[PDB]
């Protein structure tokens, strides 16, 4: 059966400014089947309050979901997105770079 | 508004 | 300009673990307005945009009754297809369906759609003439023949040309502030040194709506397509979208590069330069 790998991007809703509230996002798209596991990390640990958009799909039938949580960035906290899907041998971890 | 007639493959 | 209405339905079987998961979502252009999730506690169609929250209970009860009817036909379909493909009862399988309509810039009916996919691949689709069907699989032939005999295309044509478009116009009018708006991209560039002799210039478009946008770099006015890294347009979470495009610039050459931005919200296309 068909299996497509998720593309992953981690970023903030607004440009990051230390001390100002924002949302940390992890967008996963282009994948199939639809079961997928997405966690957001603060200094390596799983953030518990994380929500996601309702499952939808593109013209070519591939799925997409936005995972997101409120946060206030600092000079020193590190963030990341960790994803698991049938197409990945091990979970894939993407770090947040205030720049992409 | 949704289509209101059933369709089965 | 032009507008569309689309409903997306996904049904996934869960052998042993109970009834299949069924998720439905509706969109007008790039704005989601309703959802139904078989696993959620309400068991009702629910609002996802501010302008639809005002339709009354007749609307919500009727869409909840029809969305549930769709859930059940997909439950039967998961069984019918396992049979057509002689597959095991133990595996998870997916059925997806999308249907909807497009109106042009005169808001008249332009095109209608009704199509299904099974496990990620095209299964059957209503043709553009809304009178005939495309089925690639031999397995899908049974569905096509059945639908022809039962004149299913005639019923859908009626809906796509009448009901579908009439209600898209109503939504466009009722949510004019959201839907008939345009949010122009806010742009900026970043400069970061890769080595002592190259640097990455990244062109950013943020906070724009609708999603369609064209972001490109040129060097001395020549398109740099093969040499531009472009990410997929992504949602900011607040109804707008974001995108960037980057190029690697040899030392001293920043003045040669221009980033070009086209988007319906801009009075004219932007030409930006790092300087």
Residues of C in contact with B1 (CB under 8 A): 63, 163-164, 167
Of B4, B8, B9, the CB nearest to C66: B4
| Residues A7, A9, A11: CA angle, nearest 5 degrees | 170
C222-223 and C214-219 beta bridge pairing: antiparallel
* d(C-alpha C124, C-alpha C275), whole Å: 54
Among candidate residues A62, A68, A50, the one with its CA nearest the CA of residue A11: A68
Select the residue from C75, C133, C155, C165 to test the B interface by mutation, using most B Cβ atoms within 10 A.
C155
Phi and psi dihedrals of C120, rounded to 5?
85, -5
Among candidate residues A76, A56, A72, the one with its CA nearest the CA of residue A64: A56
Cis peptide preceding A33, ω within 30 of 0: yes
* Homologous superfamily of C1-181: MHC class I-like antigen recognition-like (3.30.500.10)
| Touch between chain C and chain B: 3 or more Cβ pairs under 8 Å | yes
* d(C-alpha A63, C-alpha A34), whole Å: 6
Among candidate residues A72, A78, A81, A71, the one with its CA nearest the CA of residue A26: A81
Q: Residue A44, class by beta-carbon neighbours within 10 Å (0-12 exposed, 13-18 middle, 19+ buried)?
A: exposed
CATH topology of domain C182-270: Immunoglobulin-like (2.60.40)
- Listed by start position, the domains of chain C span 1-181, 182-270
* d(C-alpha C24, C-alpha C99), whole Å: 12
Q: What is the CATH number of the domain that holds A49?
A: 2.60.40.10
**3-class DSSP state of C176:** helix
Describe chain A by its helix, strand, coil percentages, rounded to 5: 0, 50, 50
* d(C-alpha C127, C-alpha C129), whole Å: 5
Structural method: X-ray
Chain A: residue whose CA lies nearest to C206 = A14
C159 inside 8 A of chain B by CB: yes
Residues of C in contact with B5 (CB under 8 A): 155, 159
Alpha carbon distances (Å) from C148 to A15, A76, C151, C152, C156: 54, 64, 5, 6, 12
Among candidate residues C71, C91, C70, the one with its CA nearest the CA of residue C14: C91
Cα diameter, chain C: 71
DSSP string, C33-51: EEEEETTSSS-S-EE-SGG
Q: Resolution of the experimental model in angstroms, please?
A: 1.8
Q: How far does C66 lie from chain B, in Å, by closest CA? A: 6
* d(C-alpha A37, C-alpha A11), whole Å: 18
DSSP string, C105-131: TT--EEEEEEEEEETTEEEEEE-TTSS
Contacts of A61 (CB under 8 A, 6+ apart): A32, C96, C117, C120, C121, C122
Chain C: residue whose CA lies nearest to A99 = C190
**3-class DSSP state of A56:** strand
* d(C-alpha A25, C-alpha A14), whole Å: 10
Q: What is the DSSP letter of C20?
A: P
Cα diameter, chain A: 48
* d(C-alpha A36, C-alpha A27), whole Å: 12
Which residues form the domain of A65? 1-100
C155 inside 8 A of chain B by CB: yes
Query: What's the total number of domains in chain A?
Result: 1
């Amino acid at each position: 059966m068909i299996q497509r790998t998720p593309k992953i991007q981690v970023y903030s809703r607004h440009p990051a400014e230390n001390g100002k509230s924002n949302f940390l996002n992890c967008y996963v798209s282009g994948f199939h089947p639809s079961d997928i596991e997405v966690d957001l990390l603060k200094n390596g640990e799983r953030i518990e309050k994380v929500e996601h958009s309702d499952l939808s799909f593109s013209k070519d039938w591939s799925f997409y979901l936005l995972y997101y949580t409120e946060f206030t960035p600092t000079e020193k906290d590190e963030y990341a997105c960790r994803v698991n899907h049938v197409t990945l041998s091990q979970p894939k971890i993407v770090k947040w770079d205030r720049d992409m | 508004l949704l289509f209101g007639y059933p369709v089965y493959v | 300009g032009s507008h569309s209405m689309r409903y997306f339905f996904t049904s996934v079987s869960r052998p042993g673990r109970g009834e299949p998961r069924f998720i439905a979502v509706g969109y007008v252009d790039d704005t989601q307005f309703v959802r139904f999730d078989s696993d959620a506690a309400s068991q009702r169609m629910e609002p996802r945009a501010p302008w639809i929250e005002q339709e009354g209970p007749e609307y919500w009860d009727g869409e909840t009754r029809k969305v549930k009817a769709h859930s059940q036909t997909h439950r039967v379909d998961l069984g019918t297809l396992r049979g057509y493909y002689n597959q095991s009862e133990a595996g998870s399988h997916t059925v997806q369906r999308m249907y909807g309509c497009d109106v042009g810039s005169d808001w008249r009916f332009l095109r209608g759609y009704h199509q299904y996919a099974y496990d990620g691949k095209d299964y059957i689709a209503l043709k553009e003439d809304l009178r005939s069907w495309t089925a690639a699989d031999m397995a899908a032939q049974t569905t096509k023949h059945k639908w022809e005999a039962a004149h299913v295309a005639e019923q859908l044509r009626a809906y796509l040309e009448g009901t579908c478009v009439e209600w898209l116009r109503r939504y466009l009018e009722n949510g004019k502030e959201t839907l008939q708006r345009t949010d122009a991209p806010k742009t900026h560039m970043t400069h970061h040194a890769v080595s002592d002799h190259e640097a990455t210039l990244r062109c950013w478009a943020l906070s724009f709506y609708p999603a369609e946008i064209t972001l490109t770099w040129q060097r001395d006015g020549e398109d740099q397509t093969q040499d531009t890294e472009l990410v997929e347009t992504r949602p900011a979470g607040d109804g707008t979208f974001q995108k960037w495009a980057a190029v690697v610039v040899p030392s001293g050459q920043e003045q040669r590069y221009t980033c070009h931005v086209q988007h319906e919200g801009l009075p004219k296309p932007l030409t930006l330069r790092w300087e």
